Ligand binder design. Structure first.
Ligand code: M26
Ligand code: M26
Lengths: 304, 304
């Protein structure tokens, strides 16, 4: 028993991290096969960031200007190209530690592990969710750009995120591995607003099921609700509307606990309306939304 | 900016995890050099666990009874010995992935990363603290025994914990890598009480400094206190008494923020006495104590 904000083991991703330097800017790159992927803003100076013309900036750069270092060994760059907001630096050596991998674009509300890196070196790993507003609440400092988000299914790493920037609000924005930003963000040092963030309702319910499985049951009540009644409450508390697709994904947890999804919705409704009254659920004094139903089943069943 | 419950990158530890089977029991082992370390209760049947005589049980076991598998390859056991609550299985092959390592006994209040494993395979990684009562609030299911806790300093892994059991209360107990239990626990399926747990005050203050660094400042007040006045409050709220050693360790964070430690203590005092009034600090509605002053500096400076 016990429930923790668990990240995937980061080993397969650590073996892919490299340092990329261009001019005076250093950030992280991801070395898979004979390609190094990194944020295209590696070619910018702090002055360029205010309004960069990436096409014009990249034209003043040659293969030899991109310094790629894997540990203490230098990689030879034989090609460079820009795909959306990422650069693909072709190198002459395939990464011997390349895991089985995929590039995936995750949906908002989905979770992933971030391997925070500096100078091509891993510093830490944590689990987070892609917010409904397509930002992530990460932990990133200067030099962390190019750090990636991922999920692991047995031996396959699905890379879903590459870190690019921190908004003036302190939340984080980045791209998929094809360089497409999640959300309306651009890689420019300009004021950019993330829209209203909402709570990922299906994840809160999944975590309530995890709480019941792990012994925390005080919040269970004698009430039930309907999807429409629940959604009136979800709207008022800036929670994502619950759909039958979400009820269906919660099926396994409903079956395991014997608590019908709409009954768990009524417990959630009462927690939203009355608060926690100074009590905790799984060591938290707020409703946690960064665990998907898949994460709850995985952690509660020991999937390796 | 941003502050997360970050674990160390687990790669160096993943390369050491093996599966150990004895009879019908399977758990995890740690393969370092030519030795595999695992909980000695791998030799028990569920019936033995109620009151095991490990010496007598181990005498009915030979080298060939310990099945050690690293991935899909079998290791040849050439020796076995019990050291406190761990078994050391000597194998004929040194682990080619053995990192630079140390075995350390951590102090209560210190933090470490746990690589949860099942059948010698890593499932997840999370950060936790050794509670003042020498338990950990982990996430462990059947087969997780032998999963280890560790810290990493550049290239050196300091192993500090090996998982052995879950108390009937749902908290976890284990040993250092010499097999010495943290706390009064024994490896027996009997009712065992963990003493009163207290909040790690120096860690809460460190996290309050992390909150100030990352923009969360609402809790700062116009008050100050003394170590004795603060400790009267700490005693009432089951917080560990603050010492000058703790004030000294908080020195760097006090210097970075310009907030004297006793002034941060007065903010903590007011938070203990008044609560949070429905507000949050670093995304938490409770006072977080599983970050040491070292963790705060490391995360806030990007140490890799
Ligand atoms: C180097 O400043 C530029 C800035 N970079 C970050 O926010 C990246 C990084 C971060 O997540 N936090 C943080 C804190 C301190 C830093 F020095 C750097 C960071 C940027 C702004 C707008 C668009 C783009 Br693309 C990049
Ligand atoms: C196999 O039960 C024995 C038990 N093992 C655990 O608690 C280990 C493990 C855990 O942390 N949770 C959990 C949940 C379900 C399990 F089946 C196993 C676990 C034990 C009790 C007393 C002393 C000793 Br040593 C070991």
């Amino acid at each position: 028993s016990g429930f923790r904000k668990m990240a995937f083991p980061s080993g397969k991703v650590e073996g892919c991290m490299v340092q990329v330097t261009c001019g005076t800017t250093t950030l992280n790159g991801l070395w898979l096969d004979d390609v190094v992927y990194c944020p295209r803003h590696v070619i910018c100076t702090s002055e360029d960031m205010l309004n960069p013309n990436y096409e014009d900036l990249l034209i003043r750069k040659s293969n030899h200007n991109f310094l790629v270092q894997a540990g203490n060994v230098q990689l030879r760059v034989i090609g460079h190209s820009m795909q959306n907001c990422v650069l693909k630096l072709k190198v002459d050596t395939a990464n011997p530690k390349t895991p089985k991998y995929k590039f995936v674009r995750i949906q908002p509300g989905q979770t992933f592990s971030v391997l925070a890196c500096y100078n091509g070196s891993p510093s830490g790993v944590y689990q987070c969710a892609m917010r409904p507003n397509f930002t992530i609440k990460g932990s990133f400092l200067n030099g962390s750009c190019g750090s990636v988000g991922f999920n692991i299914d047995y031996d396959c790493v699905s890379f879903c995120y590459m870190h690019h920037m921190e908004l003036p609000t302190g939340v984080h924005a980045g791209t998929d591995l094809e360089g497409n930003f999640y959300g309306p963000f651009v890689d420019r040092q300009t004021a950019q607003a993330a829209g209203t963030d909402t709570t990922i309702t299906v994840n809160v319910l999944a975590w309530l099921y995890a709480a019941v499985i792990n012994g925390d049951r005080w919040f269970l009540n004698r009430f039930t609700t309907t999807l429409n009644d629940f959604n009136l409450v979800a709207m008022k508390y800036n929670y994502e509307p619950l759909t039958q697709d979400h009820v269906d994904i919660l099926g396994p947890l409903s079956a395991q606990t014997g608590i019908a999804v709409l009954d768990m919705c009524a417990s959630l409704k009462e927690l939203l309306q009355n608060g926690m009254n100074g009590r905790t659920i799984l060591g938290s004094a707020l409703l946690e939304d960064e665990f998907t139903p898949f994460d709850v089943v995985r952690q509660c069943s020991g999937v390796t």
